[PDB]
Amino acid sequence: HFIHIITGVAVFLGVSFFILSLILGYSWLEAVIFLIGIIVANVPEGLLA
Amino acid sequence: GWKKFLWDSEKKEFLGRTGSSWFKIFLFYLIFYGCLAGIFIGTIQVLLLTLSDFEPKYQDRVAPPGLSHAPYAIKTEISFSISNPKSYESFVKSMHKLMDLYNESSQAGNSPFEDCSDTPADYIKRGDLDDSQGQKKACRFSRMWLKNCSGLDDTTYGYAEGKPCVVAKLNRIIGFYPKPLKNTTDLPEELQANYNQYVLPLRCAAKREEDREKIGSIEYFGLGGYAGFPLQYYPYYGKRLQKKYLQPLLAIQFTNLTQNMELRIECKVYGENIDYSEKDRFRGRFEVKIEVKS
Amino acid sequence: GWKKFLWDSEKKEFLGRTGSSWFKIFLFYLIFYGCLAGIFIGTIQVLLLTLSDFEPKYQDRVAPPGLSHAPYAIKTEISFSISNPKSYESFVKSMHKLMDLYNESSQAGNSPFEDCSDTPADYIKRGDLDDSQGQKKACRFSRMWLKNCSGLDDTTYGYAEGKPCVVAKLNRIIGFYPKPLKNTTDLPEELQANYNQYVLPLRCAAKREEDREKIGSIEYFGLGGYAGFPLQYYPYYGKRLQKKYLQPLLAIQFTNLTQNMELRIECKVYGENIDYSEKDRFRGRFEVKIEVKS
Amino acid sequence: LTSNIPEITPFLVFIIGNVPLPLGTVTILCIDLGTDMVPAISLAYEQAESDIMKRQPRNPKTDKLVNERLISMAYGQIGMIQALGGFFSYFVILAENGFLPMDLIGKRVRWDDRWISDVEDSFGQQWTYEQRKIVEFTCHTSFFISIVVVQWADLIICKTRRNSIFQQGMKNKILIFGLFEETALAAFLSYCPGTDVALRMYPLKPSWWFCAFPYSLIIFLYDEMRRFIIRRSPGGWVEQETYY
Amino acid sequence: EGPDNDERFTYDYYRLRVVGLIVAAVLCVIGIIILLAGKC
Amino acid sequence: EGPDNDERFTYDYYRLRVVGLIVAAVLCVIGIIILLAGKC
Ligand SMILES: CCCCCCCC/C=C\CCCCCCCC(=O)OC[C@H](COP(=O)(O)OCC[N+](C)(C)C)OC(=O)CCCCCCC/C=C\CCCCCCCC
Ligand SMILES: CCCCCCCC/C=C\CCCCCCCC(=O)OC[C@H](COP(=O)(O)OCC[N+](C)(C)C)OC(=O)CCCCCCC/C=C\CCCCCCCC
Ligand SMILES: CCCCCCCC/C=C\CCCCCCCC(=O)OC[C@H](COP(=O)(O)OCC[N+](C)(C)C)OC(=O)CCCCCCC/C=C\CCCCCCCC
Ligand SMILES: CCCCCCCC/C=C\CCCCCCCC(=O)OC[C@H](COP(=O)(O)OCC[N+](C)(C)C)OC(=O)CCCCCCC/C=C\CCCCCCCC
Ligand SMILES: CCCCCCCC/C=C\CCCCCCCC(=O)OC[C@H](COP(=O)(O)OCC[N+](C)(C)C)OC(=O)CCCCCCC/C=C\CCCCCCCC
Numbered sequence: 001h002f003i004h005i006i007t008g009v010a011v012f013l014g015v016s017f018f019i020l021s022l023i024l025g026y027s028w029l030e031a032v033i034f035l036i037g038i039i040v041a042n043v044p045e046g047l048l049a
Numbered sequence: 050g051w052k053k054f055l056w057d058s059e060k061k062e063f064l065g066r067t068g069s070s071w072f073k074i075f076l077f078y079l080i081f082y083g084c085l086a087g088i089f090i091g092t093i094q095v096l097l098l099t100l101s102d103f104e105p106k107y108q109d110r111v112a113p114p115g116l117s118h119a120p121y122a123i124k125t126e127i128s129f130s131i132s133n134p135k136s137y138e139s140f141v142k143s144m145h146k147l148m149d150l151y152n153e154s155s156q157a158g159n160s161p162f163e164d165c166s167d168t169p170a171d172y173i174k175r176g177d178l179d180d181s182q183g184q185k186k187a188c189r190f191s192r193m194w195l196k197n198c199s200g201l202d203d204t205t206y207g208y209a210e211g212k213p214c215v216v217a218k219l220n221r222i223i224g225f226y227p228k229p230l231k232n233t234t235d236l237p238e239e240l241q242a243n244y245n246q247y248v249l250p251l252r253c254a255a256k257r258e259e260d261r262e263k264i265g266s267i268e269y270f271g272l273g274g275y276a277g278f279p280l281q282y283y284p285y286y287g288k289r290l291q292k293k294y295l296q297p298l299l300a301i302q303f304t305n306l307t308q309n310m311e312l313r314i315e316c317k318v319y320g321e322n323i324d325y326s327e328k329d330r331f332r333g334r335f336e337v338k339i340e341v342k343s
Numbered sequence: 344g345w346k347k348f349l350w351d352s353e354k355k356e357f358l359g360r361t362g363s364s365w366f367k368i369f370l371f372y373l374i375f376y377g378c379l380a381g382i383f384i385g386t387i388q389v390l391l392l393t394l395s396d397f398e399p400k401y402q403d404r405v406a407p408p409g410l411s412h413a414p415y416a417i418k419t420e421i422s423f424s425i426s427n428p429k430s431y432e433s434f435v436k437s438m439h440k441l442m443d444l445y446n447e448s449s450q451a452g453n454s455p456f457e458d459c460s461d462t463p464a465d466y467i468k469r470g471d472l473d474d475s476q477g478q479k480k481a482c483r484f485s486r487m488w489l490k491n492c493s494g495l496d497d498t499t500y501g502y503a504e505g506k507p508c509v510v511a512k513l514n515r516i517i518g519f520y521p522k523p524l525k526n527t528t529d530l531p532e533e534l535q536a537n538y539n540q541y542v543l544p545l546r547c548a549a550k551r552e553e554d555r556e557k558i559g560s561i562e563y564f565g566l567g568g569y570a571g572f573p574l575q576y577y578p579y580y581g582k583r584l585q586k587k588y589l590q591p592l593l594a595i596q597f598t599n600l601t602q603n604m605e606l607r608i609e610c611k612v613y614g615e616n617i618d619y620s621e622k623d624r625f626r627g628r629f630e631v632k633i634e635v636k637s
Numbered sequence: 638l639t640s641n642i643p644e645i646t647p648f649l650v651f652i653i654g655n656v657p658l659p660l661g662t663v664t665i666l667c668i669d670l671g672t673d674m675v676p677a678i679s680l681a682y683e684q685a686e687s688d689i690m691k692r693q694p695r696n697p698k699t700d701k702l703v704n705e706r707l708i709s710m711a712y713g714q715i716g717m718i719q720a721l722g723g724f725f726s727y728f729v730i731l732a733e734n735g736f737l738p739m740d741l742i743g744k745r746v747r748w749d750d751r752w753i754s755d756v757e758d759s760f761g762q763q764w765t766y767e768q769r770k771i772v773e774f775t776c777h778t779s780f781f782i783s784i785v786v787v788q789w790a791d792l793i794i795c796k797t798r799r800n801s802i803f804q805q806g807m808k809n810k811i812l813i814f815g816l817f818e819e820t821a822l823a824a825f826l827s828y829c830p831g832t833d834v835a836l837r838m839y840p841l842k843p844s845w846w847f848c849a850f851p852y853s854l855i856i857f858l859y860d861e862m863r864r865f866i867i868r869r870s871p872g873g874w875v876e877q878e879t880y881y
Numbered sequence: 882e883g884p885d886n887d888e889r890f891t892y893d894y895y896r897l898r899v900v901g902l903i904v905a906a907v908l909c910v911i912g913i914i915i916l917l918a919g920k921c
Numbered sequence: 922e923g924p925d926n927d928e929r930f931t932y933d934y935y936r937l938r939v940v941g942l943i944v945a946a947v948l949c950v951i952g953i954i955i956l957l958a959g960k961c
């Protein structure tokens with residue numbers, strides 16, 4: 001149940017800011033760095049353990 | 050000096066500043082004091098959230114209960130003429146104020162009053178100090194129980210012919226269980242006869258050894274005819290959990306009182322969680338200076 | 344499920360709550376976030392009160408000054424064809440942007456400009472870093488000083504016939520005094536001739552030993568004809584205390600440059616409070632990759 | 638969960654407001670994989686608050702483990718304060734070196750430009766590329782330390798769900814050890830030589846470490862008053878809205 | 882001051898690192914003490 | 922609890938006074954130490 005909620009806010013923030021990055025003129029090597037930062041930020045890499 | 054520092058007309062100053070200075074200072078003080086008030090109020094609200102409505106957190110300053118009476122004496126003295134009626138009016142108005150709360154009309158129905166044993170009995174626990182069960186129920190205390198001092202027969206209560214009464218009362222304490230002395234070989238002289246365990250004894254005497262002879266017959270009236278308080282009226286659950294609660298009372302008639310002479314009468318209750326104090330002359334006992342001058 | 348949790352018509356709920364729930368939650372979040380914003384703003388205002396307007400509290404991350412240039416190279420490379428004019432346009436537009444600030448029309452009158460020694464001189468202290476005296480005064484720097492690279496004669500500045508120029512500049516630091524190397528027996532080879540104490544020397548060379556031969560005659564232009572920066576333009580008092588301030592500049596013409604081949608040219612300044620870094624390739628020195636392919 | 642907001646917000650402002658990157662990706666991994674593991678592990682050693690063997694069994698179809706109340710607390714309130722504290726320390730570090738808050742909006746395009754060796758600050762100084770990058774990294778280090786500072790009060794307000802701290806008590810030795818280790822690790826990662834070659838974390842000046850303290854105390858006071866109305870008003874708003 | 886105001890651009894990061902490490906070490910020890918205090 | 926709930930009306934003022942005096946004494950000493958620290 002919570003991996004479902006966590007993933008919800010992760011894709012909502014990701015697909016949206018990726019479209020935003022190119023709506024503002026960001027090149028590809030910058031948007032990739034963004035995407036990464038946002039995915040890591042949302043996932044609690046240490047919880048399950 | 051005198052005139053200028055009050056009002057000059059070149060700089061348009063009053064007392065020293067112009068209109069914009071008095072306005073900036075006033076605005077600053079208003080904002081400052083407003084913040085001060087809001088902070089004090091917030092710190093007091095958190096305090097209202099830190100206390101309980103059904104029980105006082107600290108109950109140590111009221112551990113040994115007091116012993117008050119019905120008449121209001123200025124210096125613990127009862128002095129009145131048996132001829133002049135306007136002499137014992139201040140007393141009767143009080144006695145009456147106290148007994149006026151035990152009127153039967155007030156005590157009626159099943160709620161919230163309950164009929165209890167006409168003879169002294171044991172404690173009664175109506176649960177904990179919670180709001181789960183609604184308003185608890187208190188035992189009924191009839192006026193008539195007090196026989197010659199009830200204001201139902203002789204409104205004056207005694208003061209009319211040299212035989213005053215004194216309604217004693219035990220100070221109401223939340224969760225306080227009265228504990229009387231047991232029947233063992235150590236017990237005062239007085240208490241031996243009529244040891245109803247369920248009764249807290251009250252016994253009056255004379256302060257000095259001389260006055261004994263001048264004090265006549267102390268006639269006590271109470272629940273069951275005993276000179277004490279029935280344990281069934283305890284404990285007290287507090288105003289919030291027991292509004293319409295009546296505390297027992299004990300009447301004392303000082304019949305055969307010598308005329309034209311100051312008599313010092315000390316009344317005292319006996320019991321385990323009862324302790325007196327050499328500083329507080331109302332903790333457990335009480336003193337009265339009666340003088341029926343006629 | 345799908346439909347109900349979206350809109351039911353018995354409890355008049357949307358997404359799960361009624362209109363009064365969405366309203367209480369929204370009001371709570373608005374008040375909460377409002378308080379959060381006000382607190383952050385207050386803590387930032389006290390910060391504006393904690394700093395000075397005439398000087399940066401910490402100046403250690405900018406101690407060794409940098410060495411930048413006029414052309415804007417993407418990878419520190421200057422590559423352009425001597426035939427196709429649309430090849431060196433991105434460069435000229437920059438060079439021009441830099442020199443367009445030294446126009447004489449801008450530098451006029453007594454305020455706030457002052458005529459200084461036409462020959463290198465010593466430091467000049469216009470007092471402390473205060474507001475007591477009004478806006479300080481900065482020395483004038485004429486365009487024409489740079490002889491063949493000024494865009495006044497050959498707008499292109501050189502790029503038109505295989506002889507590009509490179510305007511070097513020292514990074515502006517508040518209260519920074521440039522200190523040149525002294526005449527003692529230890530000094531680089533290059534620096535010995537023309538030791539004007541008052542001039543900070545700039546000298547370019549080739550990164551590799553091979554490239555030496557392929558680089559022709561480095562002709563520097565500057566104040567007084569020397570290859571450096573005059574000490575009279577220091578120190579810098581900061582924007583607030585010296586708006587309309589011009590920093591010296593040094594032009595470098597790379598005449599006799601071999602055609603169709605990448606040349607690595609490293610320029611370097613010498614001095615006491617000047618130190619290079621193996622990580623920052625712009626601290627004191629700079630690298631350029633010129634290739635005049637035609 | 639609470640620490641996710643201070644890690645998500647820097648990125649979001651990076652795109653909406655165009656300010657220098659506040660929290661890098663390596664710093665994040667150093668927060669979720671480093672300083673937060675031990676405290677989260679210690680939260681298991683917590684004793685009971687009331688009587689558990691007295692309440693009825695939990696309903697599987699209605700009561701869950703992660704509901705919306707928790708999201709409203711971690712993602713909505715505590716995490717927001719932690720993010721604000723991090724941004725505070727950020728702006729402080731940049732304001733002390735010469736970049737005032739008014740000149741930071743709009744600078745990213747040139748702040749990241751690898752070929753602009755002359756970036757004017759609020760006072761007129763010219764900063765090379767590597768020089769401004771060193772400051773951004775020091776801002777990442779202080780942001781991470783601010784996270785630890787606010788996590789102190791978060792671990793204390795998370796210790797108990799209803800009861801007060803002055804009632805339960807700090808008898809959990811593991812939690813105390815977690816706080817001490819959590820602080821020692823941050824100091825070690827910043828002060829050890831050669832950490833600018835491996836993790837990109839520069840030393841901090843003793844006056845910065847105190848920029849997150851007020852936010853932490855505020856978090857503690859807010860949650861303390863929160864866990865109070867619940868005790869006095871059973872079934873009210875604070876309970877059906879913030880009681881996990 | 883004046884021309885030789887070079888100190889205005891220096892910071893003793895060395896001493897700062899030394900102290901910060903001493904402190905980190907102390908906190909680490911204290912931690913261990915608390916952790917093992919009871920198992921002896 | 923119940924009838925014998927007498928503890929609900931007792932407070933150990935003795936122990937409180939003892940501790941408060943120990944503390945006062947300590948603070949007084951510390952004070953003297955600071956005052957004379959330098960004159961020796
Ligand atoms: C120049 C020096 C000035 C010095 C200031 C001295 C401050 C004190 C001044 C007057 C004190 C008056 C007594 C205060 C009591 C107010 C009563 C009140 O208000 O009872 C309403 C609520 C209580 O509700 P309840 O029914 O739940 O309680 C019990 C519920 N039961 C019992 C049923 C369970 O009380 C509340 O909410 C909280 C209200 C607490 C009252 C604070 C009001 C203070 C007003 C101004 C102070 C600001 C001073 C700034 C300096 C100005 C200089 C010009
Ligand atoms: C969901 C997570 C939200 C996270 C919040 C992140 C906060 C940061 C967001 C954006 C930052 C933008 C940059 C801020 C700078 C504002 C500039 C400004 O304003 O410059 C006006 C004055 C400065 O004046 P000066 O001329 O003296 O300075 C210099 C004078 N010289 C240089 C001439 C000497 O600055 C002032 O006064 C102080 C103004 C400081 C700006 C604070 C504004 C923040 C706005 C909202 C934050 C609240 C968030 C609550 C959570 C909401 C969630 C929905
Ligand atoms: C401006 C700066 C803002 C900073 C904001 C963040 C603050 C977060 C850090 C610390 C907050 C400290 C809060 C203090 C709370 C004290 C509560 C307390 O004292 O409640 C007393 C309890 C209750 O006892 P009872 O009646 O149930 O006992 C019954 C015993 N029977 C059963 C035998 C009868 O007693 C007990 O818990 C037993 C004794 C426990 C003693 C604990 C002492 C350790 C306290 C803190 C450790 C320091 C952490 C520092 C982290 C920084 C690392 C660099
Ligand atoms: C209850 C159990 C308790 C256990 C507690 C265990 C605590 C352990 C405490 C200390 C061990 C730390 C490891 C020692 C590292 C020595 C590194 C060293 O001596 O470096 C010296 C040289 C620096 O030379 P330079 O100044 O000329 O460089 C100039 C560079 N310029 C100029 C280009 C900027 O290094 C270099 O060059 C290259 C630097 C290489 C980077 C190595 C750092 C490792 C990175 C992450 C590992 C840390 C994980 C945390 C583990 C926590 C355990 C609790
Ligand atoms: C409670 C337990 C506490 C202990 C946990 C430790 C806390 C930290 C936890 C996770 C940190 C992971 C973050 C990964 C960061 C990698 C950074 C990175 O890779 O930056 C790339 C650099 C760039 O170098 P360059 O090419 O410019 O050098 C040129 C040298 N020239 C030119 C002089 C020759 O490369 C380098 O630094 C090369 C060295 C690579 C560094 C690897 C560090 C791995 C760190 C942690 C992994 C182990 C954690 C296990 C503990 C789990 C706890 C549950």
Ligand SMILES: CCCCCCCC/C=C\CCCCCCCC(=O)OC[C@H](COP(=O)(O)OCC[N+](C)(C)C)OC(=O)CCCCCCC/C=C\CCCCCCCC
Nearest residue numbers: 842843844891892893894895896897900901904907908911
């Ligand atoms: C219950 C839980 C207990 C937890 C206890 C944890 C133990 C704490 C362990 C150590 C803390 C003490 C640290 C002392 C370090 C001083 C070292 C020093 O020499 O440092 C000087 C700096 C000034 O640096 P600068 O930049 O000016 O010069 C830089 C100049 N250069 C760079 C050119 C050299 O100063 C500084 O770092 C200032 C150092 C910070 C000052 C300590 C503040 C304490 C705050 C609150 C405690 C209040 C307790 C009240 C008692 C209540 C009793 C009931």
Ligand SMILES: CCCCCCCC/C=C\CCCCCCCC(=O)OC[C@H](COP(=O)(O)OCC[N+](C)(C)C)OC(=O)CCCCCCC/C=C\CCCCCCCC
Nearest residue numbers: 389392393394395843844847848849850851852853854855
């Ligand atoms: C509920 C929230 C709890 C929050 C707790 C926060 C604790 C903070 C702990 C330490 C504060 C940071 C240390 C400050 C060090 C600053 C060093 C410094 O370089 O300072 C200089 C500036 C003044 O610069 P200027 O331009 O005016 O100089 C003009 C000079 N001329 C006139 C010659 C031109 O100083 C200033 O700004 C000083 C202004 C600071 C005002 C803020 C006061 C902070 C409040 C309490 C501190 C904690 C102490 C008590 C601890 C109790 C423990 C229970």
Ligand SMILES: CCCCCCCC/C=C\CCCCCCCC(=O)OC[C@H](COP(=O)(O)OCC[N+](C)(C)C)OC(=O)CCCCCCC/C=C\CCCCCCCC
Nearest residue numbers: 821822825829830894895898899902903905906907909910
């Ligand atoms: C209850 C009682 C407890 C008592 C416990 C006592 C413990 C023992 C006492 C002290 C142990 C601390 C060790 C002190 C070592 C200091 C090393 C140091 O100060 O080095 C600084 C310099 C590097 O300066 P830089 O110029 O490159 O700066 C950069 C400048 N820029 C970037 C601007 C160009 O060092 C160098 O050059 C050479 C560095 C060589 C490698 C040294 C290895 C140190 C690494 C780890 C040891 C620390 C572990 C502490 C325990 C923590 C547990 C979590």
Ligand SMILES: CCCCCCCC/C=C\CCCCCCCC(=O)OC[C@H](COP(=O)(O)OCC[N+](C)(C)C)OC(=O)CCCCCCC/C=C\CCCCCCCC
Nearest residue numbers: 931932933934935936937938940941943944945947948951
């Ligand atoms: C820089 C300036 C330094 C100044 C230092 C001054 C030295 C301070 C000297 C002594 C203070 C320690 C006092 C400890 C006394 C504990 C004694 C005790 O057994 O007491 C128990 C009471 C609980 O009483 P009850 O009514 O529950 O039971 C009554 C039960 N019957 C009455 C039936 C028996 O508890 C209490 O009195 C609680 C005692 C108060 C708790 C201490 C709180 C400390 C506050 C702030 C300091 C934080 C420092 C953080 C470190 C930062 C480092 C950088």
Ligand SMILES: CCCCCCCC/C=C\CCCCCCCC(=O)OC[C@H](COP(=O)(O)OCC[N+](C)(C)C)OC(=O)CCCCCCC/C=C\CCCCCCCC
Nearest residue numbers: 934935936937938939940942943945946947948949950951
């Ligand atoms: C750096 C290291 C520093 C170390 C310094 C160590 C100093 C030496 C160590 C301890 C010295 C402290 C002395 C402790 C004496 C405790 C006396 C005590 O606990 O007595 C309590 C009882 C009275 O209780 P009660 O039942 O009447 O309560 C009233 C109950 N109600 C009112 C409800 C009915 O005592 C009685 O009966 C009998 C009392 C007989 C008279 C005792 C005289 C004590 C007076 C002053 C000595 C304190 C000076 C401390 C220094 C302060 C410097 C400013």
Ligand SMILES: CC(C)CCC[C@@H](C)[C@H]1CC[C@H]2[C@@H]3CC=C4C[C@@H](O)CC[C@]4(C)[C@H]3CC[C@]12C
Nearest residue numbers: 083084085086087088089090091092093094095
């Ligand atoms: C930083 C400072 C200036 C903030 C001060 C905020 C003040 C104005 C706030 C803090 C707490 C608030 C009070 C807290 C509790 C109550 C009880 C409630 O039934 C009505 C509102 C009332 C009476 C509030 C009125 C406004 C109040 C006193």
Ligand SMILES: CC(C)CCC[C@@H](C)[C@H]1CC[C@H]2[C@@H]3CC=C4C[C@@H](O)CC[C@]4(C)[C@H]3CC[C@]12C
Nearest residue numbers: 377378379380381382383384385386387388389
């Ligand atoms: C306890 C909490 C809710 C109080 C928060 C108070 C907030 C709203 C107060 C505190 C400090 C205040 C600011 C402090 C400084 C300034 C600068 C001034 O030139 C205009 C007002 C302005 C912009 C204030 C606006 C309101 C403000 C942010």
Ligand SMILES: CC(C)CCC[C@@H](C)[C@H]1CC[C@H]2[C@@H]3CC=C4C[C@@H](O)CC[C@]4(C)[C@H]3CC[C@]12C
Nearest residue numbers: 934935936937938939940941942943944945948
């Ligand atoms: C420098 C500052 C922050 C230190 C403040 C120290 C304060 C909090 C200290 C100083 C004196 C202390 C009190 C002194 C005396 C007593 C009586 C004792 O029976 C219990 C502790 C108690 C109640 C102490 C509690 C904490 C106290 C008030």
Ligand SMILES: [K+]
Nearest residue numbers: 040041043669
């Ligand atoms: K994360």
